[PDB]
Structure formats: structure tokens, C-alpha cells
């Protein structure tokens, strides 16, 4: 019966809690307590990219560490040459309520989506000189909150309906649908090998999915409120989440447990973008109080602040070669830091 | 200084910027509105009438263009979204106004409407956003009150002690009972609005029927007032 099934589920949940507690023998803070502090990290605004009419919700670096796509509520994507601040492309969108964007690893396509429930894909390199809509992927029943390219023919989308999907771009169809969340899925992060990916939703839980098999491997539950951002450690063995409870947390896949939380008493606004550095020694986190904090990812000591924005920081991206950090905010400016 | 291809790239960027200014002009000359309501509220009828008079299966947002006195308005309603609202409502914190349509002739779903209005009014991101509430379906309200079979006092006990305010303006000629009822519903909503506004945003009531052709004019007047107050703040006049 339903009561019997619920009792079995509760017993299994207690068993998983016990299994996690047994493997917890030394917190990460104890083992890191004898390594040198990072010291103060001063980052200076090197470039300021102007041109967006309205608030910026998402950005994504190119894999060449120089090109950069940005999405704003005015209804445009702009591809910037970060070194010279030139505008390479200006892509007008059909729906202005865009709130995610991705740059293909090959560099030929970009994707965007939002309240229209559609992950549109744009062909940057055509025989004609313009950018055209390659394909519109329809099938989500809620807003698209994140999109990440696996290659030029596969893309992973997380949506407002409690559901992620893996698409085939040539034939629009959803190849795999990942189900299991209870609230809106807000973020998404592909592993370095692009065989696994983690999604954080508004049920205050993050799940690691298997792209080929299609099933949820683990479920991580530590947060007190909804999860807004997620990113993999460059190792591929850990990920960091940023929530509305004004905290960031670092989970491990192998131990299946939360390692360290990044919180401060002065901070009461929610974190809305989270990214690592190349070494993973730094955890950069955006915030609603207009500023980005740079956390020493191994010791949970705030090492720096990136304070130059006049509105909330909505996106954050560390380049593939580690030279720069870009920050887009609701004041309609991006800023490249170094 | 910089090579020939770099100069040509800079010139391409400058042309992109000129197109961006052209887009900025039309972006700041159009006013964005968000339409909210329940299934029973005739917001679909409102949008259909506004589309007809003036000027894709799982799609999540619908857009409507309409123009009053050479001023452009964009009106978005959400089509395919889930029940939860706390995440996609942040996209609408720079709209000119929010249009909240409520069915005023139900009495069994009215408290749910007040709860939804309270959630909209007290939202963290929707501060400094004014609400144009349309107390819709006034004709059903009139018929229902005149029939007398369905009573309000059992749904809202406080209605008995309520009396019509002196500032009432029942225009066409109607029984005092329908006027008392409709001003009671309006006063419920306005109590919610004036409880915790703090003077940053206002609430504009309107008694409407779905057939009414004066809704676009009402929206235009309220938006004119909202921009007037915002300019008063911007130009350091208050």
C-alpha cells in the first residue's frame, strides 16, 4: 500500500543517511587547515563591454578564451571580441525574455532560450554573411533556464518544468529526458568528459545524471532554499552550488556528501552565479548585493571582492585558459577582470 | 597602430553600434506590461478584444501589441508555465505596470485571487511596479447580486458591517446593492495594496466587463501616471 511504500522509502532514506555519515571521518576544513592561505586577490576591471539595452541574464565564453556571447532582456545576443571590445555579431531574437545562452565548443553555433520554452540554435558560420536560426527545439513545458552544448549535434537543456532533456539537433527530437526533480530546474553543468552532468533545482536538491543511460545516479540535498547556480570542479569529481540561502556548498560525487559551505554573516543575499578557476583553488560567486566574492575553495575564506556593478550580478564566467573572469549584471554591462 | 583588418573590424563594430542605437530608440518608446489572472478571469477575452480593436503548441509566453494615442504597448501573458511563479516573475521587474485581472463574480475563488494579489504586491522583485487591477465580470456580479440566491455574507462575514463609502460613484444608475458589493470587493483588494506599499508603487482599480472597449484607454492613463511619478523621482523633484 501507499503507507508501506512510504515506510520503505523512509527506511531507505535513513540507510543512505547512515551510509553517508559513516564515510564522514574528516571534514575538508580539518585536512586543509595546514595549507598556505591564498592571500588577498585584487582583480581589476580591464574591459567594460557596453551596448546591451537592458539587463543581462547570461553569458558564456568561447573555448578560444577570446570570444564571448551575452544575452539581455532587450532581445539580443552579442558576440564580443574580449581583447579589443569589438562587437562581432548582434543576433536579434524572436522572444525578448531570454535567460540562458551557450557558445558551442567548436565555435560554430550559439544557443539561447527563455520564457518561450524553446532552445533556439544559431549558425554563426554560414556561406551567407549573417547568423540564421539553425533549429528551434520545442518540447519543454516550462521556461528554459540553461542550455549547454555537448558537441555540434547534441545539447542539454534544463527547464522550468521539473525536467532536463538531451536533444539531437539535426532531428529536433528529445533523445533522452531526465526526470526526478520536484521544482524548477535552474542551472546545469557538463562534466569535462561530457558523459555526466549535474542540475540544481528549486527543490533545494542537485542530481548527477548519466547522459548515455538516462538515469539519476545520485541526489545531493543540503541547501535550505532553491539552487540558482551550479558548476563542476575542473577535476570532474566535485561541484559547487549557489542558493538563495546566501550560501555556496561544495559537494563530492565519489563520497556522495557535502564537503564545505561558503557563507558569511554579512552576506544575506542569494548567490546567482558560481564558477571555478582553472586550478579550482578559487570559487567565484555572484550575488544580489551587486558584488562578486572570490572564495578560497579549499579553506572557505573570502579572498576578494569584484565590486564594480551598479545592479545585481546575474552571470559569471571564467575563461578556459584562466586569464580572465567576465561578469554581467542587470546594469547592462559586462566587465572583464584580471 | 592597428592593421587594416583590425580597422575594418572596428568599423563593423561601429555599424553594429549604430544599429543598436536605432533599436534603443524603439525599445525605450514602447511600454512593457505583464498580464496576470486565473482561468475564470476573462483576461483571454481582454487580450482578444484589445487585439481586435487595435491592430507554437507549448509556447510559454504570448505577446500583444496595441497602441493608444501613438504610444506603443507590449502586453505579455504567460501561457505554458507551471503553477510556481517565484522564479520567472523576476524577469518582469522593469515593466511599466502589471495588469491583474480578477473575476469579481465568483465568491468561491475570490480569496484565492486576493492571496495571489498579495503575493504579487509583496514580491521582492516587484517593488516599484504598479498594479492595474481589473475587477472583471461586473455584469455577472450585477446579475448574481440581483438574483439573491447566492449571498456574500457567508463567504465574507465582514460584508454585513460594511457600508458604501462616500466617495462612491455608481454612474449608469444601478441598485445600491450591486454598488455596495462591488465597492466591497474593490476595498478588499485596496486594503491589501495600501497595507504595505510604502509609497514606492500604487494600485489602480477599475470596474470592467470583458466587452468594454475602454480598457486600452484605462491602461494608457494609468501608465501615464506611473511614468509621471517615476519622472518626478528621476528629475529630483521629489
Amino acid at each position, epitope marked *: 500500500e501507499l503507507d508501506q511504500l512510504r515506510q520503505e522509502a523512509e527506511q531507505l532514506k535513513n540507510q543512505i543517511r547512515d551510509a553517508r555519515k559513516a564515510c564522514a571521518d574528516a571534514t575538508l576544513s580539518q585536512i586543509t587547515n595546514n595549507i598556505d592561505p591564498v592571500g588577498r586577490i585584487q582583480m581589476r576591471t580591464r574591459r567594460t563591454l557596453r551596448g546591451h539595452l537592458a539587463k543581462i541574464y547570461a553569458m558564456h565564453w568561447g573555448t578560444d578564451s577570446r570570444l564571448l556571447v551575452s544575452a539581455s532582456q532587450d532581445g539580443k545576443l552579442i558576440i564580443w571580441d574580449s581583447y579589443t571590445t569589438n562587437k562581432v555579431h548582434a543576433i536579434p531574437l524572436r522572444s525578448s525574455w531570454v535567460m540562458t545562452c551557450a557558445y558551442a565548443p567548436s565555435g560554430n553555433y550559439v544557443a539561447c532560450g527563455g520564457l518561450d520554452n524553446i532552445c533556439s540554435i544559431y549558425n554563426l558560420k554560414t556561406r551567407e554573411g549573417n547568423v540564421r536560426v539553425s533549429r528551434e527545439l520545442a518540447g519543454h513545458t516550462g521556461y528554459l533556464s540553461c542550455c549547454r552544448f555537448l558537441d555540434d549535434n547534441q545539447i542539454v537543456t534544463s527547464s522550468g518544468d521539473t525536467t532536463c532533456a538531451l536533444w539531437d539537433i539535426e532531428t529536433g527530437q528529445q533523445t533522452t529526458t531526465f526526470t526526478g526533480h520536484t521544482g524548477d530546474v535552474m542551472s546545469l553543468s557538463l562534466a569535462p568528459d561530457t558523459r555526466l552532468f549535474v542540475s540544481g533545482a528549486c527543490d533545494a536538491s542537485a542530481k548527477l545524471w548519466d547522459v548515455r543511460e538516462g538515469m539519476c545516479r545520485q541526489t545531493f540535498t543540503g541547501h535550505e532554499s532553491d539552487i540558482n547556480a551550479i558548476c563542476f570542479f575542473p577535476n570532474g569529481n566535485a561541484f559547487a552550488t549557489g542558493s538563495d540561502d546566501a550560501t555556496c556548498r561544495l559537494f563530492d560525487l565519489r563520497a556522495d556528501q557535502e564537503l564545505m559551505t561558503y557563507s558569511h554573516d554579512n552576506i544575506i543575499c542569494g548567490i546567482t552565479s558560481v564558477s571555478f578557476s582553472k586550478s579550482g583553488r578559487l570559487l567565484l560567486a555572484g550575488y544580489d548585493d551587486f558584488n562578486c566574492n572570490v572564495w578560497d575553495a579549499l579553506k572557505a575564506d573570502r579572498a576578494g571582492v569584484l565590486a564594480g556593478h551598479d545592479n545585481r550580478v546575474s552571470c559569471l564566467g571564467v575563461t578556459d585558459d584562466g586569464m580572465a573572469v567576465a561578469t554581467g549584471s542587470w546594469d547592462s554591462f559586462l566587465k572583464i577582470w584580471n | 597602430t592597428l*592593421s*587594416a583588418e583590425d580597422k*575594418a573590424a572596428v568599423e563593423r563594430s561601429k555599424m553594429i553600434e549604430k544599429q543598436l542605437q536605432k533599436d534603443k530608440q524603439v525599445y525605450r518608446a514602447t511600454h512593457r506590461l505583464l498580464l496576470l489572472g486565473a482561468d475564470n478571469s476573462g483576461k483571454s477575452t481582454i487580450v482578444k478584444q484589445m487585439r481586435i480593436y487595435h491592430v507554437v503548441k507549448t509556447s510559454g509566453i504570448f505577446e500583444t501589441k496595441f497602441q493608444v494615442d501613438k504610444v506603443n504597448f507590449h502586453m505579455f501573458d504567460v501561457g505554458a508555465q507551471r503553477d510556481e511563479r517565484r522564479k520567472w516573475i523576476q524577469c518582469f521587474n522593469d515593466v511599466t505596470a502589471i495588469i491583474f485581472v480578477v473575476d469579481s463574480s465568483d465568491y468561491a475563488r475570490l480569496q484565492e485571487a486576493l492571496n495571489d494579489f498579495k503575493s504579487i504586491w509583496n514580491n521582492r522583485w516587484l517593488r516599484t511596479i504598479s498594479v492595474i487591477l481589473f475587477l472583471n465580470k461586473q455584469d455577472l456580479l450585477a446579475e448574481k447580486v440581483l438574483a439573491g440566491k447566492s449571498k456574500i455574507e457567508d463567504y465574507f462575514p465582514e460584508f454585513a458591517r460594511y457600508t458604501t463609502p462616500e466617495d462612491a460613484t455608481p454612474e449608469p444608475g444601478e441598485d445600491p446593492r450591486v454598488t455596495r458589493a462591488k465597492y466591497f470587493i474593490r476595498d478588499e483588494f485596496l486594503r491589501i495594496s495600501t497595507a504595505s506599499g510604502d509609497g514606492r508603487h500604487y494600485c489602480y482599480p477599475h470596474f470592467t466587463c470583458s466587452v468594454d472597449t475602454e480598457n486600452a484607454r484605462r491602461i494608457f492613463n494609468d501608465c501615464r501616471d506611473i511614468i509621471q511619478r517615476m519622472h518626478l523621482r528621476q528629475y529630483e523633484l521629489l
Partner: single-chain antibody
Amino acid sequence: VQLVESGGGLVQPGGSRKLSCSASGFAFSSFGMHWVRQAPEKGLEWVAYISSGSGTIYYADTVKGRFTISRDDPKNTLFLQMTSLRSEDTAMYYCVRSIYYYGSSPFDFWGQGTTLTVSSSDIVMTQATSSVPVTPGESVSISCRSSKSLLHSNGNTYLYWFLQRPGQSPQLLIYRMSNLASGVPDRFSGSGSGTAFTLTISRLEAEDVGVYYCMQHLEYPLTFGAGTKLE
């Protein structure tokens, strides 16, 4: 994509003649355009340049006040009004398409060309081997050299390689000494050092026979070089 231009013919000396270039199949208004000519049996020679948005116009010193370049974006055509045609203007004029942003490939499409006959401190590029014998199946190493270093402080060396089969117009093979253009097989590769450059065809096939021209884009005017003939 295609570019069809017209307006060439026998012109008495001292006359005038307008050449139009009708474009179709691509976003013309966002492409800079060039006019490139070659004398009846000589190499290519750059003539003029008009930018996207018509904001930059350049001419060769040999045609500076004589010719004028213009474009008509809504009608999607390109013009070259010419005045006082001397006898050194007998050539076949090519309409070339070029877009400039980070990573773009300029000079990627060339029109079929119009023949014109008239009755009776710039970088030099030299291609010394002015003929090469070759047989199907083996590897050739066409060479080129420069007067001024083509390497810029950016990191690019603006050297381009063009192939002209005995019939049709030139088609881009390599841009900025290392990048194969779209549609060119991986049999072609390029290298160089700043002043001396080479183009390697790994496994030559019967469609690679023609004349190979190089070109610099470091600064205007654009100079070419006589070109090596593969036979």
C-alpha cells in the same frame, strides 16, 4: 552565393565606362567589396575597395583620381565608374567579397569577371619560381617572399594564397598563411616566417593545375606577385 558583373567591352582611349557587380545569395550590405584586375596574360592587380556602410574607400595609386567605387545596398549592386581610360586598363575585372571580423576569411568569393579592352613605399611580393613541372601523385612546395615583414603585433601574418584554374576566377585557398578556406581540401597547407612563405600541396591531383597567386593584406595597396604556374 554568386556575383555576376557586367559592363565590359571595347572602349576608345580617353573614354569612360561603368562596371556593375550584381550580387545575390548572401548578405551584401555586411560585406566589403573589392575590384581586382589582371591584364590579358599577367598577374592580378588590386584596383579599389569600398567598405560595408560605405565609410572607407581606397584606390590604387595607378587609378587614384581616375576611378570611383560605389555600392547600392538596397538594389544590391556594386559599381566602378571609370574615366579617361588609358591603354593600361585592358584587363579582366573581378568582383571580390570580403568580410572583416575576428576569425573571418576575406576574399573568399570571387565573381566570374568582365573583360575590358581599350584600343591603341608599398610592399612588394615576389614569386620567383615562375613555372614548375609536376606529376599527379607528388608533393609541390610553391614559394613566396616579401619585402616588409607581414607579421603584425597582433600575431597575424596577412598572407593569402589564391588558385586560378585555367578557366574560372580565383578561389581562396589559404588566408593568413595557416587557415584553409571553407571547401578547400586538407591537401593544402601553408607556412612561413614573416618574410618568406610557402604553400604545400601534399598529394597533387589533376584539379590542382593552375596559377597560384599570393597576396598581402597588411596595408593598402594590396599587392600580389606574378604567381607560379603548375603544369
